[PDB]
Amino acid sequence: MRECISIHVGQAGVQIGNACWELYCLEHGIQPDGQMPSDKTIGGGDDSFNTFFSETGAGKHVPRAVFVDLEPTVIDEVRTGTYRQLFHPEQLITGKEDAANNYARGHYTIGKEIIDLVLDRIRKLADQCTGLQGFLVFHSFGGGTGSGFTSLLMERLSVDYGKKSKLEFSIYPAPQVSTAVVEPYNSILTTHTTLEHSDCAFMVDNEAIYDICRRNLDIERPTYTNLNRLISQIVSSITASLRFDGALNVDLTEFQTNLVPYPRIHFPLATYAPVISAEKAYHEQLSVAEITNACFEPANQMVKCDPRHGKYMACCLLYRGDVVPKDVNAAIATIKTKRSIQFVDWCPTGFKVGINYQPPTVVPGGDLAKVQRAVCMLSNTTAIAEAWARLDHKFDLMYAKRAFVHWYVGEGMEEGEFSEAREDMAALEKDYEEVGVDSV
């Protein structure tokens, strides 16, 4: 059992969903028609991949997933694209008119008209589970739908499924590919309203991904496709422990216990290696040591910040492929003797390690090399609060003049919601300060 349900919200969430499900199909040997010849138990089973896929009597393997957008053109591409047969039509839900980059339309004016249908389709998925574990929610911070509708949905899920865990994958805005001036408003509004409803959230900064694609894959001007394929490799590293078995495999829930010391402090920093082109991977085999070292190079982080000027509260290493513990231990010993790794005084310094043997996969025609071994580090560090600071400053500059605020008031919001949200962010920055001070 232990099933998980994925929810993909708005453009960014949908398109990242496409990249993730394509990659999962390649990892498990599922064809685009849904057939899986290696699966000899027809119509059911409790194999590890059944946490993410259900099975019909006709042998089709069907994602446990809902896609939601308030306009139709992005999800229409899924309806007509390569993987159109993977999904039942009731899983693909669209309205007619979007939120126009406005949190208030996604949470209230437009969002209210579709929330009950979305919840009922989710209920249909939940009823097929024999031991549902929780939810995975994919969305942008900056869009009207990804911010406001996601907020609304999280509130309703807490009502209908109680304390059942909810995890986020959240796209943090960058000016190089950003399309709206108001993205800082939406980011604070959704972060305030979701903070009590989420158990754990993985932020992905578009500027970090853009930089990595340019520097390591030699792509002059990266597209959404490049970014989403790399993101999907990180997501796959995180969920691999849920989707494959094995004796050195370590459950993600067990990492959550270690990653979250207080309910509000639930935002891990992800780092992935190696990201390398085919031309450079040739005749250059990367060892366990080289990739483990690369996990402490800030240029490989998913969020721009400097862990060397904060403190660690947890540090986890998720290996996949041709990796044995002996080489892990030698690499860790070296890193401990060489780098600036300072823990808070109320927390032990041991690194937690997992190994999955199933090797990494790449998509055909991609810009990533196929490699024999890879690693994802997840750290809980105070340095991540720098990203909140950057966003809060931009919020202040505009709000002092009330710029664009009339667009929100016209949909029924009050200024009090702006200032209440901003205060909650101020208190979060203060929490991150308090957890790094020494005991007395």
Added chain:
Amino acid sequence: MYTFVVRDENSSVYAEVSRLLLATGQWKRLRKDNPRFNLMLGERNRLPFGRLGHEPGLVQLVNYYRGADKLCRKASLVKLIKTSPELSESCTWFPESYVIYPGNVWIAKSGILISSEAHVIQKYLEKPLLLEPGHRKFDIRSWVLVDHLYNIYLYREGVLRTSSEPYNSANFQDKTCHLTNHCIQKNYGRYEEGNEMFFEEFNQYLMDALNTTLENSILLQIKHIIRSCLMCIEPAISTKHLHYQSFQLFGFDFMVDEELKVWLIEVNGAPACAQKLYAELCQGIVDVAISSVFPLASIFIKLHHHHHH
């Protein structure tokens, strides 16, 4: 007591600064070769910067930035503009100019010659804004103070240095109508005192004749230009973290064309001031540049801009 030395006898500005400091009661002047000074008012030529900042127990301050000559010579300025990416060969507010070693009207300068035949060669501005009455050319002087922290302060009073001759397209040999220098003019004095017009009158004129203000039509561009020039050289000359500190007073000269576009002509590294404003400006230097470092027992606009993008 703070202590100071005077080493340039011809500075009017610093003769008044000196007299003010003395009349404070809390500053003592020393002979030009005593090394135990807090503040040097230096010479213009070959100021000995290598001998500053090596006196235990004295904070030492000087009224010049080492390296600022790069901005304050014509050839150096042309080279800095063309070769600096923050300015570039396509800089819109500086006239097209070419270094030469020993509408096609040009001016040669470093005795001046303006012709369309034939040092720096610079495009001569054929369509200047002409003041009425008198159909006459002018230039704008602005004073700017840069402190030890590299704050950039624009003195709120400027001056227009006018011609008192009608402008003549068809005579570039005769320089009295083309060149607005104070000495060269002394019909001197007819319209205004000493061929100097101040901001209150000029703003009134722009309102009455062109239905706009000095602030909107002209001053935005002046501020943009001053800030761009000084931010360009900041890494080369800043004294932050250095063992001695610097401030300096600069004189920017501008030309205004008939569509209200502002052009930079010249940066002067050792300006004098218009008479009427000595008292006020020199007091401002003491307040902002000296007592900030050596405290005792606003006429400026601070130029700062941090746009996010």
Added chain:
Amino acid sequence: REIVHIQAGQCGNQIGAKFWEVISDEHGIDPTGSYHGDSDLQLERINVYYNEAAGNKYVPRAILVDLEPGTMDSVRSGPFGQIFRPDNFVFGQSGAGNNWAKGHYTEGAELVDSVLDVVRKESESCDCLQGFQLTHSLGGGTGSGMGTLLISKIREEYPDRIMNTFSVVPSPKVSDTVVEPYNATLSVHQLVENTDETYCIDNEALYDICFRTLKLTTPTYGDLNHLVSATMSGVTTCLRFPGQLNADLRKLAVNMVPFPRLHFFMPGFAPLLTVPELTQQMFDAKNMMAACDPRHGRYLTVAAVFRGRMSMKEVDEQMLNVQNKNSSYFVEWIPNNVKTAVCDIPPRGLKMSATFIGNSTAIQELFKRISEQFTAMFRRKAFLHWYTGEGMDEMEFTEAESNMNDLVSEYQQYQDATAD
């Protein structure tokens, strides 16, 4: 999805027709309404501006309005005149004689209901109407007064749809008709309250461009309208061809309008090459379609649209360069206020082009000019009997003047604001 287009009066109808000619040419639609293009990119978002009729015929979603009949004849005889729906022509007989009060209160009020019937029939069959665009001049009688009446009535029936205008501002260099500043002030008073977006197309600037830059010694209306049609084509490019961007009129408005009253834009076009040259030229005062120097103010927001095949890396680098070198002209308290679009399909007869849309406080210079001419007449009450004879009070003139002065003062307030 669907946009409904309205053109009112002589000026509005002439530029409307040119707009429909240019975009019909860009989509490969002939005067009969048949598609004969070479590329699927032409039809993918065709329905934004065109209906499909039987036989795969494409018919503009366009309504044609005047109080003067005969402009209807000149349109109908124009090259694309057969393409328009015959029932969409709504014309009176009387004329308005350059009198705003006739357009807004008397002759135009009688006809407005028949105009609304056609509007409603077109709107009812839209899958998902985004809103409306109107072309008119502000200096005549029909387009200014009746057009702003139409705007008010549409807002009553579609209060949640976007209302956009392309509004031609008068200049003594093109028309000597003496009452124009009255008509423009009275219309602007309406526009401040009831539109989301107004492109200020200034006949002053168009004349100066035709004379100085294009070297046309005696500019005709045709030369001005060539510039207008190229600009309007540029500014609707991002809705009209498939291309990285997923937007609707409301999201554009949300990106461009920080305060509800400050929604009057300065358009530009270049050339009248390399990416640096285009970029430098589009930010030059001489390329603006409003007679304003942007260096006499500050930008609240800017959109830049490039057309043709070029390097996206290079476009990004040049936009950053102009912002870095001209930083004083962008308000520091709105981060990331410059947006860029690239369309692969060039306009007819060019390999590369740029269209500019600016929300600048320098637009106050335009409003000041008009204001001066207004006061020159109002202080002597010249020609006022033309308007009071239609039932108007002096008081309405006083209020309109006051509102335009307030708009100016507000632009100045945001020009002077700082961050610290």
